[PDB]
């Protein structure tokens, strides 16, 4: 089997992407944030504290003939940005782009933090990291991909995120029309439960490529590109007036600037992030100071190839017995 679903930016800055997901019988369609950096499929629901719901579509398990309470199971998750959610667990039928999993753990939120409440466009998350990170207790649950895997034509999914445009998540096949040139594959470590890999270096604009190992994670649920301070300093040094602002929380630059591209290495291959992808617009409405899309990972504890990087590529998440990641230009 295969599935194919369109993913759409939630706003004009590509802050996140939502993908429609069918849950239950009859189907309840919720727009979920597919997150290769976490491993819980959780939804706003009829159980979510009412004051914490502001415009989201909710899952109502009592209206699904295939929903079953997973007795005794609870979940609680905190994300890298400090947001969080928690609740209890149902199993139900879940379909993405025509690919159906029965008995999927659907984690029903009783509580969500303010960032989730304030984002009316995101009805929940669908985690696509390794199932070892799943937070359900006392019995850890599998991700949608892990459950689907044995049925898939090939044990893969691909992320093809758009720049200010829709894109695609495919499951079970590689669309050879969706990228240019070849796919370069690179090793993955699952030791931390992430799609963790090592980039072979970087370039700033038309500058020479610096060969250097950068360990990081491919994370569709993170907006920006977080890299070591040395790398990020080298990038912003090429932008007149750019500076790191502790008050704002990162690198800012004059909105009048033209930003250079940023290249990252995948083996001997190179992925180029256009400068426009790195402009995240005014820090506040009407400001002429703009927020950078490449930021330091210092004090995050890990480098993160978030949407800024991933949307410049066609990305293969290969969940074979030995997992790998593939990147192609597009």
């Amino acid at each position: 089997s295969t599935g194919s679903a369109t993913t759409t930016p939630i706003d004009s800055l590509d802050d996140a992407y939502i993908t429609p997901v069918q849950i239950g019988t009859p189907a309840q369609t919720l727009n979920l944030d597919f997150d290769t950096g976490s491993s819980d499929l959780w939804v706003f629901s009829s159980e979510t504290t009412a004051s914490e719901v502001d415009g989201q579509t909710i899952y109502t398990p009592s209206k699904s003939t295939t929903a079953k309470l997973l007795s005794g199971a609870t979940w609680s998750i905190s994300y890298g940005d400090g947001s969080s959610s928690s609740g209890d667990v149902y199993t139900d039928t879940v379909s993405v782009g025509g690919l159906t999993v029965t008995g999927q753990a659907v984690e029903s939120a009783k509580k969500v933090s303010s960032s989730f409440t304030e984002d009316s466009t995101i009805d929940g998350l669908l985690g696509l990291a390794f199932s070892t990170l799943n937070t359900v207790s006392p019995t850890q649950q599998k991700t949608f991909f892990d459950n689907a895997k044995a049925s898939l034509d090939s044990p893969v999914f691909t992320a093809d995120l758009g720049y200010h445009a829709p894109g695609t998540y495919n499951f079970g096949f590689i669309d050879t029309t969706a990228y240019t040139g070849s796919i370069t594959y690179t090793a993955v470590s699952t030791k931390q439960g992430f799609w963790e890999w090592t980039s072979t270096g970087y370039a700033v604009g038309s500058g020479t490529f610096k060969s250097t190992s950068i360990d990081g994670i491919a994370d569709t649920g993170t907006t920006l590109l977080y890299l070591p301070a040395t790398v990020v300093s080298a990038y912003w040094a090429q932008v007149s007036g750019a500076k790191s602002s502790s008050s704002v929380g990162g690198y800012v630059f004059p909105c009048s600037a033209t930003l250079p591209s940023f290249t990252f290495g995948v083996g001997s291959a190179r992925i180029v992030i256009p400068g426009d992808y790195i402009d995240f617009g005014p820090i506040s409405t009407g400001s002429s100071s703009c927020f950078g899309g490449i930021q330091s990972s210092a004090g995050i504890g890990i480098n993160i190839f978030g949407d800024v990087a991933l949307k410049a590529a066609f990305v293969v998440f290969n969940g074979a017995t030995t997992p790998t990641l593939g990147f192609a230009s597009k």
Side-chain angles (χ1 to χ4, degrees), residues 1-62 64-67 69-109 112-141 143-148 150-190 192-242 244-330:
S1 304
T2 62
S4 182
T6 299
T7 193
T8 303
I10 65 164
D11 64 22
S12 64
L13 298 177
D14 295 347
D15 280 316
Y17 296 78
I18 50 172
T19 308
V21 177
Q22 283 70 49
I23 308 175
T25 308
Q28 300 179 38
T29 299
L30 275 66
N31 295 328
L32 303 188
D33 185 349
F34 283 23
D35 180 15
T36 63
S38 69
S39 306
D40 288 50
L41 192 175
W42 73 260
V43 297
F44 279 78
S45 75
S46 52
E47 301 178 328
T48 311
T49 301
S51 65
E52 297 180 350
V53 182
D54 189 8
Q56 294 80 9
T57 294
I58 63 167
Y59 168 59
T60 302
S62 66
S64 173
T65 63
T66 42
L69 180 71
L70 186 62
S71 176
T74 58
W75 62 279
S76 183
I77 192 162
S78 300
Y79 296 99
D81 69 342
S83 67
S84 64
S85 52
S86 60
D88 52 24
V89 186
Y90 293 81
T91 57
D92 207 342
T93 301
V94 172
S95 301
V96 175
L99 170 65
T100 301
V101 167
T102 56
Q104 174 64 45
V106 176
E107 304 173 33
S108 168
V112 304
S113 64
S114 61
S115 50
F116 289 117
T117 299
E118 293 161 356
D119 191 352
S120 65
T121 69
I122 292 175
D123 301 327
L125 267 62
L126 190 150
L128 293 167
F130 293 87
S131 292
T132 53
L133 293 179
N134 176 266
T135 77
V136 178
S137 179
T139 306
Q140 190 171 60
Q141 302 294 306
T143 71
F144 174 82
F145 178 53
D146 266 357
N147 284 322
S151 306
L152 294 177
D153 289 358
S154 181
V156 305
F157 68 90
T158 65
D160 181 9
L161 303 180
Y163 169 64
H164 297 159
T168 306
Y169 281 101
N170 288 331
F171 291 83
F173 72 105
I174 289 164
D175 182 355
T176 59
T177 74
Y179 58 87
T180 57
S182 300
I183 305 177
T184 299
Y185 290 87
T186 197
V188 163
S189 174
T190 63
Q192 296 196 92
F194 298 121
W195 291 93
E196 186 173 3
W197 64 290
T198 303
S199 173
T200 48
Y202 70 99
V204 175
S206 59
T208 61
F209 185 86
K210 177 71 170 181
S211 294
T212 186
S213 293
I214 306 171
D215 294 341
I217 67 169
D219 187 359
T220 58
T222 291
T223 313
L224 306 185
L225 175 53
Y226 295 88
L227 292 171
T230 47
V231 177
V232 176
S233 182
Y235 178 81
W236 289 109
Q238 297 305 310
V239 178
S240 194
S244 183
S245 170
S246 51
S247 57
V248 176
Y251 281 90
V252 297
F253 67 92
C255 292
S256 61
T258 299
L259 298 179
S261 62
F262 184 89
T263 301
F264 64 94
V266 182
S268 57
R270 306 290 180 252
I271 299 295
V272 181
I273 305 171
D276 290 344
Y277 290 25
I278 299 161
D279 177 10
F280 277 76
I283 59 173
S284 288
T285 305
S287 178
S288 68
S289 180
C290 274
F291 197 69
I294 296 175
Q295 296 293 345
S296 179
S297 65
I300 293 178
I302 196 156
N303 302 302
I304 308 174
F305 294 86
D307 298 335
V308 162
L310 301 181
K311 75 188 178 193
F314 177 87
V315 187
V316 180
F317 294 78
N318 170 29
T321 301
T322 300
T324 65
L325 270 176
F327 291 83
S329 296
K330 66 186 184 191

